Amino acid sequence: KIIINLFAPNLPGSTKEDDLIQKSLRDQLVESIRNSIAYGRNVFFVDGTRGAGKTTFINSVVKSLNSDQDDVKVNIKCLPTIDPTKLPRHEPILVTVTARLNKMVSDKLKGYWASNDYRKQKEQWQNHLA
Amino acid sequence: KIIINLFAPNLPGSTKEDDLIQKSLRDQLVESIRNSIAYRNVFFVDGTRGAGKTTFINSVVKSLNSDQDDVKVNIKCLPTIDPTKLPRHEPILVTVTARLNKMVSDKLKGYWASNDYRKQKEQWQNHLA
Numbered sequence A: 001k002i003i004i005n006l007f008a009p010n011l012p013g014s015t016k017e018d019d020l021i022q023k024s025l026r027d028q029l030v031e032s033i034r035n036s037i038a039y040g041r042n043v044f045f046v047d048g049t050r051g052a053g054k055t056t057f058i059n060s061v062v063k064s065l066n067s068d069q070d071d072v073k074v075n076i077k078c079l080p081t082i083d084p085t086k087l088p089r090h091e092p093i094l095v096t097v098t099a100r101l102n103k104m105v106s107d108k109l110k111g112y113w114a115s116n117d118y119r120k121q122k123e124q125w126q127n128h129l130a
Numbered sequence B: 001k002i003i004i005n006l007f008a009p010n011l012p013g014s015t016k017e018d019d020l021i022q023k024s025l026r027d028q029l030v031e032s033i034r035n036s037i038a039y040r041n042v043f044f045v046d047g048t049r050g051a052g053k054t055t056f057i058n059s060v061v062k063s064l065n066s067d068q069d070d071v072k073v074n075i076k077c078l079p080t081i082d083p084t085k086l087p088r089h090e091p092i093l094v095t096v097t098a099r100l101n102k103m104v105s106d107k108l109k110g111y112w113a114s115n116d117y118r119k120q121k122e123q124w125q126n127h128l129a
């Protein structure tokens, strides 16, 4: 049941469930990603011409994996989608990944309830960042 | 009854219970200290040189640093400051703060809740800074 509302904004940000043109792909891509972790580089590619809806499709995959965090036995954490065109011209991708990964780790550090657990893992994270 | 062993070292650090001489003053000073805060809270221990002031004042801190739970009033005592063994130009406020900071840092490292530890640590360092 895919119902496209033409008078809706119909933008990658505003696209939700039940009006995603690509839904069989989204369902099967998530399962393939999960199975590759349950069992080197593990890189998936989603191809398509310009305007095919890559940004709309890949955001749903991040949304699909983010939902039901603890419920799924295989746990995958998704960083926010990186857009190479909107990044600074000379800013490295490894810097972008770490900066987004650091915030995800940092917000988890602020979520602990044990002082020693938070204190010990904070310096380990800072040691690797250094 | 107090028994002094002349073959013992008989030093301020090597004086224990039943060997300390002025227990009557020590017992009534610790209680007097406790009632002073249960209600310029400065007490003075007078004595001529060689009367045993260091031995007496070490026991008062030793007595006040035990069985804190039973007594209604809780007093935390810094290690005794000897003004003659400090550096010549170091202010007393620096010496007191540097010893107050350690026990606080030992208390912060003793917490279990990570949120309480974080909030107090930045509050403490704000005063220190």
Ligand SMILES: Nc1ncnc2c1ncn2[C@@H]1O[C@H](COP(=O)(O)OP(=O)(O)OP(=O)(O)O)[C@@H](O)[C@H]1O
Residues within 6 Å of the ligand: A004, A010, A011, A012, A015, A019, A020, A021, A022, A049, A050, A051, A052, A053, A054, A055, A056, A057
């Ligand atoms: N599932 C969908 N439901 C409704 N409209 C869609 C859907 N997928 C794509 N569209 C429409 O097609 C357009 C294609 O834009 P989209 O960003 O998804 O594609 P892209 O060209 O691969 O990405 P980018 O903007 O990053 O270049 C959207 O702006 C939207 O108007």
Ligand SMILES: Nc1ncnc2c1ncn2[C@@H]1O[C@H](COP(=O)(O)OP(=O)(O)OP(=O)(O)O)[C@@H](O)[C@H]1O
Residues within 6 Å of the ligand: B004, B010, B011, B012, B015, B019, B020, B021, B022, B048, B049, B050, B051, B052, B053, B054, B055, B056
């Ligand atoms: N309670 C005590 N029991 C036994 N001997 C004591 C006692 N108090 C003092 N003395 C004896 O007197 C000596 C000097 O004591 P203490 O060091 O306390 O003297 P003070 O002059 O008050 O202080 P300071 O040593 O800092 O000048 C001890 O080393 C010991 O020989």
